[PDB]
Design a protein around this ligand. Structure first.
Ligand SMILES: C[C@H](OP(=O)(O)O[C@@H]1[C@@H](O)[C@H](O)[C@@H](CO)O[C@H]1O)C(O)O
Ligand code: NA
Length: 492
């Protein structure tokens, strides 16, 4: 009869379906279905196992870089939003506007819009199907930005009429799946958009059902309640793979798990204790015990997806228990227990990783205690000391995420109080405008050195993202924190 409905058991849900505000480990797998971008990354180009870097036309049928500051897009014609309104350059201009995204006025609507954006100038609408995106200063990052999760295309009139909050609860996009319902902290339901411009949706419906406990998620797959489950650990591989009708599907993703600090707190204003905690983390033993060797430990804030700004000659991050003990003493730390906030196992292995780290920190003379918090119940900033986090490396360049998250205009310095050395912020400003070359390459290596010296966050590893699925549900994971169903979902 009708197509099969897809049932997903997920680790968590975003609090909003507004595509920029949905940026997280849990939002993109949903908003990738509701929306489209001008340029799309094709993870399966030339038979790649879901990790190809190839950029292909999407809402823009073609594009041309004009100069060091601008890129002109030719829009695909007769593309319709879910409410029937035709996609125009007006919708694109609005998506990348000062008003909605990067200007001072957008900070209330999209709190991280300005900090995550390029140094944009107002878009230029040439005609109904022609729009130029430009920057005030040189930027060779326009293309990678436009293909990213910052750039899902929103409908101007409908978005303006509802406002960013109401739009977030009733999204309208051009994507293969349209909005049905959103029960905050419970479920999101989408249905097939059969008016879709690209590959027709193969599922009649998609339900993202929150299953916070991974053991309950695994039981749900074994019982036949879910078709695909997310955010498992390599420790679940043996059991699931013992069921002949189920299997695990995993891949290393372009993201790093970390722990970070509220540097507005007295104990973390200075770098000494941040550094002591960083120097005591035995990453290889965590990777062996919890990840069955599947996770990858980077040589600093440095990843292969950065391409020309990836440094393959970089030394491993320091591990020095004896130096850590000496820093604990010099910091003046008195033995008072320091809290570490985690949203249960929102991050695969969050609590087992923390338990191991608590033990490593006991050995250097620092008492760390776990504090759990329910989905969407993140405690006030001044109630937090240490906390876990992750960063999706969302550009084919080193700019992201060191500059958008840890730069002078970023939330780590502004909200979380990192007093970054003046040199670090000078380098951030330089890498933003410089073209690729020796000067830019060396500036990112100096920024990586300062990042390790300062420890505003401590990089753990790139997780091996593990899903489990029914063998009769054909779907391949991609090397990013999202799920792709276009030409990548079939049943039987
Ligand atoms: C607690 C959640 O954070 P999560 O680690 O899931 O997502 C990060 C995101 O915060 C960050 O802006 C981007 C780019 O650095 O990477 C995402 O992985 C929050 O965003 O809902
Ligand atoms: Na499809």
């Amino acid at each position: 009869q009708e197509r099969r409905a897809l049932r997903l058991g997920v680790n968590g849900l975003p609090n909003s379906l507004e595509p920029v505000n949905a940026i997280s480990n849990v939002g993109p797998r949903i908003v990738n279905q509701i929306f489209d971008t001008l340029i799309a990354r094709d993870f399966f180009a030339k038979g790649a196992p879901g990790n190809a870097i190839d950029l292909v036309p999407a809402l823009a049928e073609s594009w041309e870089r004009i100069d060091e500051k601008s890129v002109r897009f030719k829009l695909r014609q007769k593309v319709m939003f879910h409410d029937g309104v035709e996609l125009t350059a007006d919708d694109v201009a609005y998506t990348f506007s000062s008003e909605r995204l990067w200007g001072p006025e957008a900070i209330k609507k999209i709190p991280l819009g300005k900090s995550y954006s390029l140094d944009f100038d107002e878009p230029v609408v040439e005609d109904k199907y022609t729009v130029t995106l430009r920057t005030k200063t040189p930027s060779y990052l326009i293309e990678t930005f436009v293909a990213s999760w910052m750039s899902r295309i929103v409908p101007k009139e409908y978005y303006k009429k509802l406002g960013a909050v109401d739009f977030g609860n009733k999204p309208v996009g051009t994507g293969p799946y349209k909005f049905v319902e959103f029960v905050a902290g419970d479920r999101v339901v989408l249905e097939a958009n059969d008016a879709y411009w690209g590959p027709k949706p193969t599922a009649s419906k998609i339900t993202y059902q929150i299953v916070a406990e991974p053991a309950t998620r695994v039981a749900g797959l074994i019982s036949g309640e879910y078709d695909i489950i997310t955010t498992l650990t390599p420790d679940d591989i043996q059991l699931i793979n013992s069921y002949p009708d189920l299997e695990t599907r995993g891949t290393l993703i372009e993201n790093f798990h970390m722990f970070t600090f509220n540097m507005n707190q007295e104990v973390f204003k200075d770098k000494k204790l941040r550094r002591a905690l960083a120097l005591a983390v035995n990453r290889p033993i965590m990777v062996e015990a919890l990840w069955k060797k599947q996770a990858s430990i980077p040589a600093g804030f440095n990843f292969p997806n950065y391409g020309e700004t990836f440094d393959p000659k970089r030394k491993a991050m320091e591990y020095n228990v004896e130096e850590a003990k000496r820093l604990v003493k010099e910091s003046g730390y008195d033995g008072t227990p320091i809290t570490y906030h985690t949203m249960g196992n929102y991050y695969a292995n969050a609590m087992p990783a923390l338990m191991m780290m608590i033990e490593m920190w006991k050995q250097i003379g620092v008492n760390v205690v776990m504090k759990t918090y329910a989905p969407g119940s993140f405690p006030p900033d001044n109630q937090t000391w240490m906390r876990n986090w992750s960063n999706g490396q969302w550009m084919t360049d080193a700019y992201a995420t060191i500059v958008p998250e840890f730069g002078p205009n970023g939330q780590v310095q502004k909200r979380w109080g990192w007093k970054a050395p003046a040199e670090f912020n000078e380098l951030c400003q330089k890498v933003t405008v410089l073209p690729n070359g020796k000067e830019r390459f060396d500036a990112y290596n100096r920024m990586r050195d300062i990042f390790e010296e300062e420890a505003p966050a401590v990089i753990l590893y790139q997780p091996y993202d593990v899903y489990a699925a029914r063998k009769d549900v054909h779907w391949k994971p991609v090397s990013f924190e999202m799920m792709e169903f276009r030409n990548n979902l079939s049943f039987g």
